[PDB]
Swiss-Prot record, chain A:
GO terms for biological process: photosynthetic electron transport in photosystem II; response to herbicide. The record marks 182 as: Stabilizes free radical intermediate. Its EC number is 1.10.3.9. It is an enzyme of class 1 (oxidoreductase). It is a multi-pass membrane protein. Disulfide bonds: none annotated. This is Photosystem II protein D1. It comes from Chlamydomonas reinhardtii. Fe cation binds at residues 207, 264. It catalyses: 2 a plastoquinone + 4 hnu + 2 H2O = 2 a plastoquinol + O2. HAMAP family: PSII_PsbA_D1.
Curated annotation (Swiss-Prot), chain B:
It is found in: Plastid, Chloroplast thylakoid membrane. Keywords: Chloroplast, Membrane, Photosynthesis, Photosystem II, Plastid, Reaction center, Thylakoid, Transmembrane, Transmembrane helix. Belongs to the PsbJ family. GO terms for cellular component: chloroplast thylakoid membrane; photosystem II; photosystem II reaction center. It comes from the Eukaryota. This is Photosystem II reaction center protein J. The chain holds residues 8 to 42 of 42 of the full protein. It is a single-pass membrane protein. Its main location: plastid. The chain crosses the membrane at residues 3-23. PSII is composed of 1 copy each of membrane proteins PsbA, PsbB, PsbC, PsbD, PsbE, PsbF, PsbH, PsbI, PsbJ, PsbK, PsbL, PsbM, PsbT, PsbX, PsbY, PsbZ, Psb30/Ycf12, at least 3 peripheral proteins of the oxygen-evolving complex and a large number of cofactors. It forms dimeric complexes.
UniProtKB/Swiss-Prot annotation, chain F:
Disruption phenotype: Not essential, grows like wild-type at 25 and 17 degrees Celsius and from 20-200 umol photons/m(2)/s. Loss of PSII-light harvesting supercomplexes. Loss of PSII-light harvesting supercomplexes without a decrease of major antenna proteins, at 17 degrees Celsius and 100 umol photons/m(2)/s loss of minor antenna chlorophyll a-b binding proteins CP26 (Lhcb5), decreased levels of CP29 (Lhcb4), less extreme pheotype at 25 degrees Celsius and the same light. Altered phosphorylation state of PSII and LHCII, impaired non-photochemical energy quenching. One of its GO terms (cellular component) is photosystem II reaction center. The gene is psbZ. PSII is composed of 1 copy each of membrane proteins PsbA, PsbB, PsbC, PsbD, PsbE, PsbF, PsbH, PsbI, PsbJ, PsbK, PsbL, PsbM, PsbT, PsbY, PsbZ, Psb30/Ycf12, at least 3 peripheral proteins of the oxygen-evolving complex and a large number of cofactors. It forms dimeric complexes. HAMAP family: PSII_PsbZ. It comes from Chlamydomonas reinhardtii. Induction: Transcribed as a monocistronic and dicistronic transcript (with downstream psbM). This is Photosystem II reaction center protein Z. The chain crosses the membrane at residues 8-28, 41-61. Belongs to the PsbZ family. It is a multi-pass membrane protein. It is found in: Plastid, Chloroplast thylakoid membrane. Keywords: Chloroplast, Membrane, Photosynthesis, Photosystem II, Plastid, Reaction center, Thylakoid, Transmembrane, Transmembrane helix.
Curated annotation (Swiss-Prot), chain H:
It is found in: Plastid, Chloroplast thylakoid membrane. This is Photosystem II reaction center W protein, chloroplastic. Part of the photosystem II complex. PSII is composed of 1 copy each of membrane proteins PsbA, PsbB, PsbC, PsbD, numerous small proteins, at least 3 peripheral proteins of the oxygen-evolving complex and a large number of cofactors. It forms dimeric complexes. The chain holds residues 60 to 115 of 115 of the full protein. Stabilizes dimeric photosystem II (PSII). In its absence there is a reduction of monomeric PSII.
């Protein structure tokens, strides 16, 4: 028509008729995730071993170097680099990039930029369909959690080596070293997040049971119960008064939601608020505000010290403090 | 009823948050005070 | 007050009832502006009341006094304290003045006219009136531009501020020559934020910190007049949402980013947050360890250059990946540090071997021995060691309170951004209430 | 490596400018709502 | 510490920081007084 | 002039505790502002009186 | 038991009492809150 | 000088540019995307008006 | 029924038991209510007054200075190791105040908790049959029972004592968790790796379905408080399953299309997770743990250049075992020179 080249282009990005919606976050999400995906696969398979700690003992992380799926990892950037922006072109040779912890910092910068914008297009499509916009808020609870383990925690420590590796056994070392230095289990933000998922799983097992247990009889018994629902129907597929009536007898009548719109808000609000504190937990633990510490706290008269369980957890932490980075510490404090 | 409910919960809710402050006060003094 | 059946807003989303009520809303901000000043006065007098002026200021759990002390009130050379009467005045000044804001917050919220539109025409505003918003914007740019000049005038005429880079321990200095070069000032903004560059935390002298405020003082007065005499252009009409909640969420996107910067500046910058007052930084306390434990070999006489470590790297001094003479161990990650107790020990090629073995002042080790002990890593009940440290001392740095609080405060405002900027975009379109159930769009689209 | 650094700057500032000049192009009227 | 003409008022000033927390608690008291209309 | 100041400053807290309590009661009563209009002006000005009175003799102490 | 710790807690009773006292005096006398 | 490299990580050069071809790359790509947007502004509505946004 | 049989005393008792009331008693209430009440009441008694100084050798009560985090009803000592510690039995012999001192108040809570959990699951059966529903709420609660029975009962009945059970306290769990990392390497058991995916996967379905419903609602009121617009007896649904399908179909790629299958999928993901983690604890009760990979312990034995994070984890498990087991297992009477425990340097 009389439309420009640009208007032809903007009526394609914001077109909802596409199989996967792009939108304007997706024009910079899609080339960042396909960057970060395609480099994650290669370094998980063919990365040469990385000096993680700067002491020139390279750690293996590739499947081609005698690892399996569980011990495979993408090894973090070396301790000598620290927080210096280390792209591919600052290295002289390409193998100097790989040995120093190259593809960790390439992935994380494209990953975190990708998931900030995957949250963006969850808003953007919801504006293109007339939906209410707050699904993008609920995706910020993992985005707050993933920003902390990759970016907010290496800032407070000063190096990308202390961030979390991209591996299954790589994660498990990061959980151990963290609690040895910061005692995460004795921090009320990790206590909220633990209740965020034990409550979150309970509120899914309980809600999903009662909707299944109040289904209306529409099929036979040889046919599955999922055939009673036909897609896009108007009438309700389960009795709601019967499930409040059941759950009202179960504990007491005031302990239930009869308003199903107030119910589904509670299912959204409980884990999302819970993950927000355990995302802010290690965000504050990144700036060295560890947790509780009740060592040598219960004492009697005559100046003696009684053990508690907190002194037992001390012995676990003290056994891991003196073992992580085994050839690094030249000095009797772990300030770094 | 006789007494309004709103100053029932205020008096009880003050004496509950007044009660919690003792247990924080008792955390730095007395037993378990680490001294 | 009001009710739910006339506005459709419950008791908990109740402050949203006074969107279209101009006058009540004015009392709502004034009353809240009282509480900020009231917290400023009360917490200042509280911290003066528990202040021992012979111990260091950062040891006693203090955050508002080093803000006043950075300006140079009652302080002398090396970070000492002369008199604590000016710290008493500002706590008194804010606390009395909060009641003046307190009366205006009570008055307009109760008895003053709830819509000041047709009675007071200069103050009345409709949220779609774009010329009126750019006025109310442009007035406050002056009030926030003039406030930048007060720091400039106090650093150039009224005694000056605490310059921690002065020779022989920092003290109060009148900054006579502010660096106002635009290439020098705007070099910080378009600098990368990664290590060694440090976007705006790496401003290292007092010559620039007040040097920059001459720009932002001038621009916010030049920009404030610009928005008074102009309306937004038709591309800005094609770009923004022009409601009441939309103006809020624009702000919440801004001060979410403000929190993350003050989160980082109080953790890294020992120039605007001097280490004599706020305590040492994390990178400063770690580099203080290897320096003081290099004095602890000079008393024994072993060669710090030839001290090879267990991995063959150098126990005390090693080489940077850009080729500079730095410290060694696990503190190699902090080699980007600069500090006034250590910068008189560096030459061209980093720190000099011949200078470190001979040219150590006695006060430099004395300051670098407090900074080994008072490292900022602590606990939550204020124990103050590593997590494997028993209940002995009672210290955790104000840098660790400011970086943790202003991260979380500056985080939820970004969640505050994504709430309101979605809702204001939805409610301007029409479907904030839900799907229509009669003419809805998804039933009018093609499949897949 | 300079040949690679001049290529990333062409790539990034292409997609960054599709972003900035994309939201300016009357995105708040690209909605299914009616008035 | 406080000045010496002001030192008998140290017990009052150790309450003053907690006051703004009591304003958000007042707003729930007032909404219970109107019984959440 | 210490005890002159301390009696004047105990007097301030008694007036402020009146003005913290009574002044919202004056506003939120029906027609309470048209009745006690000059009454509050006495209590407000006496607050403004004492704050300079306490403020001036700090130079003498 | 100090004279300082006591008068501090006397000071806290008066302020906490002053909160709902504004609510009580308008729930009885005026009725406009 | 075993190897040749950038030597540009701790330098603080503005926008990371060190060769002036990068500034023309930063600016020339920007002006081209602006030029296509400015031409195609004819289709995006003409809000030369008193108040014509997505108001409420 | 339908032949006029007479009424017996048992029939008369049933009507009182299955009478509607503010709290439902039923027949299962005779098993539930006196067994559940003594469990938590026996927990609050033990955490408050009852020591642990004779069993483990460490204080555990509020009457000793332990706070809410560090108070625990502790397990018995490893002397008994499998006795039920009856208050009349030979380890106690009637004396109550010496019965608590041997840690026997642990077994009072664990055993009265088990018959509580049987009774509470029976509670969900007879309420469902009264209201004539389907039993799927009862079937989901078996997965908390399988976690309880395996961890607190099958695991000490396979190990050497009730000593190695978890103690009913907050920080006492925190060593039991840290027991399983060093001594078992429990993070590499795939039965726990399928437990995590059940927990974190069900937390994700609680957050999406609660937000997809809440953002695809139908405009039925006019106040913006959208909770007001729900008459719960209405025949139509409250949100748009068509729109919610097309959102995640273009955001994510595949989405639900079946409201019956969806809530059943929210049933299946947490239940399979715990049931696939109750199997892993059974292997730990026999110490059939997935501690090692053979082909990497060999390669790290002959070469001091090869390592992974796996070999870095085996050293950290040695740091938990060789350090805390001096105080954790006091019945083993073992002492350590400070040279026999592994360290790094400085
Ligand atoms: C009900 C729900 C159920 C129960 C839930 C429990 C949580 C309820 C809310 C918790 C608040 C409790 C307040 C009283 C306990 C307390 O804290 O009391 C402690 C203190 C005062 O107690 C004193 O606390 C001191 C703290 O040390 C301080 O002083 C030391 C030197 O003495 C050092 O200088 C050190 O640096 C400095 O921290 C010492 O430990 C004293 O021994 C001790 O007596 O009260 C205070 O501070 C009060 C805190 C005021 C400031 C709060 C905001 C701070 C924001 C910064 C952190 C960001 C958010 C957290 C991120 C993680
Ligand atoms: C463009 C891409 C931006 C990406 C942000 C990366 C930030 C990482 C970082 O290195 O940040 C650190 C920088 C400061 O940089 C530091 O700057 C320092 C400057 O100090 C030097 O100079 C100082 C001058 O006083 C001192 O003297 C000091 O001792 C001396 O060493 C050093 O150079 C350090 O090496 C250098 O790392 O802070 C800042 O840039 C503050 C601005 C960015 C804050 C970001 C915080 C994380 C937020 C993530 C989003 C939150 C979650 C949202 C999800 C929902
Ligand atoms: C080390 C250093 C590295 C440096 C790197 C460089 C970084 C540069 C950062 C710049 C960041 C700015 C980004 C925001 C720009 C916003 C532009 C805008 O909102 O723009 C909105 C406005 C809209 O303008 C209006 O557009 C209107 C369009 O009308 C048309 O459309 C109307 C309806 O749409 C009617 O139909 C009407 O009939 C029809 O004519 C009219 O033309 C008006 O007269 C006109 O005022 O545009 C304008 O004013 C734009 C005014 C400013 C333009 C700036 C251009 C700068 C170019 C620099 C040199 C580049 C060289 C390029 C070479 C290319 C080849 C190699
Ligand atoms: C600091 C926070 C703040 C502020 C300034 C306001 C302010 C306001 N709110 Mg909001 N509100 C808040 C928090 C806040 N609110 C919170 C946290 C909630 C959730 C509980 C609400 C929920 C809410 C609802 C549901 C409603 C309001 C309404 C109002 C307005 C009128 C209230 C009224 O009629 O007074 C009458 C109240 C009283 C007479 C009680 C006494 C109040 C006095 C002022 C306290 C005095 C304090 C202090 C001691 C005075 C010192 C003296 C001074 C002179 C020195 C007012 C502008 C109403 C509205 O929509 O207005 C149109 C309304 O319906 N608010
Ligand atoms: C915080 C205060 C504030 C606020 C809220 C606003 C808000 C607004 N301004 Mg105002 N303005 C302000 C301060 C403020 N301004 C100041 C201080 C100045 C003086 C410089 C101006 C000058 C100004 C002009 C001249 C115009 C506005 C316009 C606008 C409107 C649209 C802005 C826009 O599209 O941004 C979106 C942001 C962008 C499109 C990109 C901006 C990024 C800039 C260019 C920063 C890059 C600078 C960089 C660091 C320098 C590189 C140096 C290097 C070469 C070494 C909006 C209502 C416009 C308007 O509507 O007219 C009334 C308009 O024409 N403002
Ligand atoms: C119905 C609820 C219920 C259930 C299931 C249990 C179950 C249990 N309790 Mg708890 N208890 C209950 C109620 C219950 N109790 C109440 C109400 C009290 C308060 C008084 C207690 C107080 C209590 C204490 C203080 C203790 C227990 C203990 C026990 C355990 C030992 C069981 C045992 O030896 O009984 C054996 C008896 C039976 C199983 C009854 C069987 C019926 C017989 C076979 C009928 C034949 C009778 C016939 C006349 C006998 C003739 C003998 C003749 C030759 C002389 C077991 C887990 C002990 C424990 O926890 O272990 C550490 C313990 O110390 N309970
Ligand atoms: C949540 C908010 C958290 C805080 C946000 C605010 C702080 C973060 C931003 C810091 C300042 C960034 C300004 C420019 C800095 C800079 O140019 O560094 C330039 C940096 C690094 O540039 C490097 O500089 C080094 C030192 O000279 C070396 O020379 C390297 O070769 C060079 O690459 O480039 C980047 O980090 C990538 C920029 C791409 C940004 C993509 C996002 C765009 C999204 C859409 C935006 C719409 C508007
Ligand atoms: C609207 C409203 C609201 C709010 C309100 C407010 C917020 C208010 C504020 C107010 C304020 C904000 C006030 C303030 C006040 C203050 C004052 C009143 C002060 C005083 C002071 C003094 C008295 C001092 C004294 C002294 C001195 C002189 C010095 C030292 C010593 C002493 C301390 C003694 C609410 C929420 C409720 C809701 C409803 C309505
Ligand atoms: C004082 C100081 C200083 C200085 C400072 C300064 C000078 C600053 C400035 C600053 C500035 C000057 C800034 C700016 C910024 C900007 C921005 C931040 C922008 C933003 C943008 C936006 C936000 C946009 C958006 C959009 C898009 C994207 C598209 C469409 C739509 C819209 C439009 C919305 C110094 C450093 C020297 C020193 C220190 C201190
Ligand atoms: C400056 C000053 C002053 C003033 C002060 C003030 C201004 C105060 C205020 C105060 C206040 C104003 C307070 C308030 C209070 C209140 C409260 C403390 C309440 C509480 C409550 C509760 C805690 C509860 C709640 C609840 C309810 C009721 C319902 C819902 C649920 C619950 C239960 C949560 C004076 C003059 C004295 C003098 C000195 C200085
Ligand atoms: C062993 C025994 C037994 C039993 C006994 C019992 C059963 C008891 C019970 C007991 C009980 C039944 C107890 C209860 C308790 C409770 C408590 C002790 C509580 C506490 C709490 C607290 C401390 C807190 C509170 C709160 C909360 C919750 C939060 C917020 C705040 C408040 C404060 C409100 C029998 C006889 C079988 C045999 C003999 C011996
Ligand atoms: O990097 Mn991964 O973990 Ca933060 O502490 Mn020192 O450095 Mn290392 O050791 Mn401990
Ligand atoms: Cl080290
Ligand atoms: Fe549901």
């Amino acid at each position: 028509e009389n439309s420009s080249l640009w208007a032809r282009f903007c009526e394609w990005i914001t077109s909802t008729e596409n199989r996967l919606y792009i939108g304007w976050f997706g024009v910079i999400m899609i080339p960042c995730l396909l960057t970060a995906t395609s480099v994650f696969i290669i370094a998980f398979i063919a990365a040469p071993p990385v000096d993680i700690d700067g002491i020139r003992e390279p750690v293996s992380g590739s499947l081609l170097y005698g690892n399996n799926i569980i011990t495979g990892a993408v090894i973090p950037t070396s301790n000598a680099i620290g927080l210096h922006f280390y792209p591919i072109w600052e290295a002289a040779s390409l193998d100097e990039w790989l040995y120093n912890g190259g593809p960790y910092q390439l992935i994380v910068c494209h990953f975190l930029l990708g998931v900030y914008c995957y949250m963006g297009r969850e808003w953007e499509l919801s504006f293109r369909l007339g939906m209410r916009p707050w699904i993008a808020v609920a995706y910020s609870a993992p985005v707050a959690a993933a920003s902390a383990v990759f970016l907010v925690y290496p800032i407070g420590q000063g190096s990308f080596s202390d961030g979390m590796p991209l591996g299954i056994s790589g994660t498990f070392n990061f959980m151990i070293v963290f609690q040895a230095e910061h005692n995460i289990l004795m921090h009320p933000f990790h206590m909220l997040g633990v209740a965020g998922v034990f409550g979150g799983s309970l509120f899914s097992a309980m809600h999903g049971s009662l909707v299944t247990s109040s289904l209306i009889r529409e099929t036979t018994e040889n046919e599955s119960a999922n055939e009673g629902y036909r897609f896009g129907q108007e009438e309700e597929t389960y009795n709601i008064v019967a499930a409040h009536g059941y759950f009202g007898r179960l504990i007491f009548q005031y302990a239930s939601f009869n308003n199903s719109r107030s119910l589904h808000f509670f299912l959204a609000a409980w884990p999302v608020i819970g993950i927000w504190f355990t995302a802010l937990g290690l965000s504050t633990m990144a700036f060295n505000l560890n947790g509780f510490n009740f060592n040598q706290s219960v004492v009697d008269s005559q100046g003696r010290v009684l053990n508690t369980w907190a002194d037992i957890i001390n012995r676990a932490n003290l056994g891991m403090e003196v073992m992580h980075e085994r050839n690094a510490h030249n000095f009797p404090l772990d300030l770094a | 009823g006789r007494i309004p409910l709103w100053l029932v919960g205020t008096v009880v809710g003050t004496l509950a948050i007044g009660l919690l402050a003792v247990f924080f006060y008792g955390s730095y003094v007395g037993l378990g005070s680490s001294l | 007050g009001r009710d739910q059946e006339t506005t459709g807003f419950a008791w908990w989303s109740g402050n949203a009832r006074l969107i279209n009520l101009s006058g009540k809303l004015l009392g709502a901000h004034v009353a809240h502006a009282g509480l900020i000043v009231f917290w400023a006065g009360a917490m200042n007098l509280f911290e003066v009341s528990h202040f021992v002026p012979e111990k260091p200021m950062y040891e006693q759990g203090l955050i508002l006094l080093p803000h006043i002390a950075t300006l140079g009130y009652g302080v002398g050379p090396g970070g000492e304290i002369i008199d604590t009467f000016p710290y008493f005045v500002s706590g008194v000044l804010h606390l009395i003045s909060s009641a003046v804001l307190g009366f205006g917050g009570v008055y307009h919220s109760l008895i003053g006219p709830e819509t000041l539109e047709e009675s007071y025409p200069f103050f009345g505003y409709v949220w779609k009136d774009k010329n009126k918003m750019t006025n109310i914007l442009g007035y406050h740019l002056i009030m926030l531009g003039l406030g930048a000049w007060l720091l400039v005038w106090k650093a150039m005429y009224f005694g000056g501020v605490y310059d921690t880079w002065a020779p022989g321990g920092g003290d109060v200095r009148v900054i006579t020559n502010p660096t106002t070069n635009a290439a020098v000032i705007f070099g910080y903004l378009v600098k990368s934020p990664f290590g060694g560059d440090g976007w705006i935390c790496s401003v290292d002298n007092m010559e620039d910190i007040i040097g920059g405020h001459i720009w932002i003082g001038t621009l916010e007065i030049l920009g404030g007049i610009w928005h008074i005499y102009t309306t937004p252009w038709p591309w800005a009409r094609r770009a923004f949402v022009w409601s009441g909640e939309a103006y809020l969420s624009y702000s919440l996107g801004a001060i979410g980013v403000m929190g993350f910067i003050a989160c980082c500046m109080s953790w890294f910058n020992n120039t605007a947050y001097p280490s004599e007052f706020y305590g040492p930084t994390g990178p400063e306390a770690s580099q203080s360890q290897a320096f003081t434990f290099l004095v602890r070999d000079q008393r024994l006489g072993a060669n710090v250059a030839s001290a090879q470590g267990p991995t063959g790297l150098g126990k005390y001094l090693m080489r940077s990946p850009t080729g500079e003479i730095i410290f060694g161990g696990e503190t190699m990650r902090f080699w980007d540090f600069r500090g006034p107790w250590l910068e008189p020990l560096r030459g061209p090629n980093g720190l000099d071997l011949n200078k470190l073995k001979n040219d150590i002042q006695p006060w430099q080790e004395r300051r670098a021995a407090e900074y080994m002990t008072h490292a900022p890593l602590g606990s939550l009940n204020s124990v103050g060691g590593v997590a494997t440290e028993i209940n002995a001392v009672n210290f955790v740095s104000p840098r660790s309170w400011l970086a943790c609080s202003h991260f979380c405060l500056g985080f939820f405002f970004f969640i505050g951004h994504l709430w309101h900027a979605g809702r204001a975009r939805a409610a301007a379109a029409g479907f904030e209430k839900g799907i229509d159930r009669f003419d809805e769009p998804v039933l009018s689209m093609r499949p897949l | 490596m300079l040949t690679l650094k001049i290529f990333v700057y062409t790539v990034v500032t292409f997609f960054v400018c599709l972003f900035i000049f994309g939201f300016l192009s009357n995105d708040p009227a690209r909605n299914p709502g009616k008035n | 510490k406080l000045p010496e003409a002001y030192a008998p008022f140290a017990p009052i000033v150790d309450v003053l920081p907690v006051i703004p927390v009591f304003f958000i608690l007042l707003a729930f008291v007032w909404q219970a007084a109107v019984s959440f209309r | 002039m210490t005890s002159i100041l301390q009696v004047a400053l105990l007097a301030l807290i008694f007036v402020s505790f009146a003005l913290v309590v009574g002044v919202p009661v004056v506003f939120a009563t029906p027609n309470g502002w048209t009745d006690n209009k000059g009454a509050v002006f006495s209590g407000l000005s006496l607050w403004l009186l004492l704050v300079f009175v306490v403020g001036i003799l700090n130079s003498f102490v | 038991m100090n004279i300082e710790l006591a008068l501090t807690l006397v000071s806290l009773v008066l302020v906490v009492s002053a909160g709902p006292l504004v609510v009580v005096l308008l729930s009885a006398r005026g009725g406009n809150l | 000088l075993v190897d040749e490299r950038m030597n540009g990580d701790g330098t603080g050069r503005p926008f990371g540019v060190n060769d002036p071809v990068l500034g023309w790359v930063l600016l020339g790509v920007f002006g081209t995307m602006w030029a296509i947007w400015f031409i195609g502004q004819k289709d995006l509505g003409d809000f030369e008006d008193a108040d014509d946004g997505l108001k409420l | 029924g339908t032949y006029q049989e007479k009424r017996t005393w048992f029939d008369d008792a049933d009507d009182w038991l299955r009478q509607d009331r503010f709290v439902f008693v039923g027949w299962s209430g005779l098993l539930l209510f006196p067994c559940a009440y003594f469990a938590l009441g026996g927990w609050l008694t033990g955490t408050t007054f009852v020591t642990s100084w004779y069993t483990h050798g460490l204080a555990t009560s509020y009457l000793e200075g332990c706070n809410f985090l560090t108070a625990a009803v502790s397990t018995p000592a490893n002397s008994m190791a499998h006795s039920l510690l009856f208050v009349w039995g030979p380890e106690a012999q009637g004396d109550f105040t010496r019965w608590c001192q041997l840690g026997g108040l642990w077994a009072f809570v664990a055993l009265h908790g088990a018959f509580g959990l049987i009774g509470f699951m029976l509670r969900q059966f007879e309420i469902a049959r009264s209201v004539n529903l389907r039993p799927y709420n009862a079937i989901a609660f078996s997965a908390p029972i399988a976690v309880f029975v395996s961890v607190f009962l099958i695991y000490p009945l396979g190990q050497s004592g009730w000593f190695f059970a978890p103690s009913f306290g907050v920080a006492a769990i925190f060593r039991f968790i840290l027991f399983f990392q060093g001594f078992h390497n429990w993070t590499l058991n795939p039965f726990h790796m399928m437990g995590v995916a059940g927990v974190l996967g069900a937390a994700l379905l609680c957050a999406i379905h609660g937000a997809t419903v809440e953002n695809t609602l139908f405009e039925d009121g006019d106040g913006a408080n959208t909770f007001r617009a729900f008459n719960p007896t209405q025949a139509e649904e409250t949100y748009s399953m068509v729109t919610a399908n097309r959102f995640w179909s273009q955001i994510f790629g595949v989405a639900f299309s079946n409201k019956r299958w969806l809530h059943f999928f929210m049933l299946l993901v947490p239940v399979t997770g715990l049931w696939m983690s109750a199997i892993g604890v059974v292997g730990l009760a026999l110490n059939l743990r997935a501690y090692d990979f053979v082909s990497q312990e060999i390669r790290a034995a002959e070469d001091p250049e090869f390592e992974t994070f796996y070999t870095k984890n085996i050293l950290l498990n040695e740091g938990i075992r060789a350090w805390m087991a001096a105080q954790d297992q006091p019945h083993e009477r073992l002492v350590f020179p400070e040279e026999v425990l592994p360290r790094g340097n400085a």
